[PDB]
Amino acid sequence: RKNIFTGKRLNIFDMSLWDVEFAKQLATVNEQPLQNGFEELIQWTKEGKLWEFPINNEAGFDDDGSEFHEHIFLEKHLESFPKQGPIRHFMELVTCGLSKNPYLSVKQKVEHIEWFRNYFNEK
């Protein structure tokens, strides 16, 4: 007349690929077919096939964690160029043009500046 969780016990205690496959076959015990459309949408969202809502038009894009000062102030890369000549004028204009380019990353702008540096160095 007593519940099965009371009685004699052992009393002996007191308080790689193997793991990967173990977890994979744990995944199976709760592997049932989709039961309706909402579950299908949830499954695809978890898989990442579906867009996130509300739509963020810049989702998955962070521009390498760049800051605005790295895009708008690009004149620090013109230090190795002439400081008061006509090349200074042309490069100031070029960096003004690059700083107003929203389609380019900072890396592309700096490599443009470096190409100009190299071309003038050869000449």
Binding site: E92, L93, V94, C96, G97, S99, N101, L104
Partner: protein
């Protein structure tokens, strides 16, 4: 044009990042330049599906 308007305008240009030196307009073009930025393969897919017995 009062020279006061002139230097106040070129200060505005420095603050907002426009070209401070007015370089006329013909040489202003490169600012615009730098401000901006396969039916073949699909057919051998169709051929491959044919070979595998899944097209036509």
């Amino acid at each position: 044009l009062s020279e006061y308007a002139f230097r106040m305008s070129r200060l505005s240009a420095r603050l907002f990042g426009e070209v401070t030196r007015p370089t006329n307009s013909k040489s202003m073009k490169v600012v615009k330049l730098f401000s901006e930025l396969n039916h073949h393969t699909y057919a051998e897919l169709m051929q491959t599906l044919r070979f595998l017995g899944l097209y036509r």
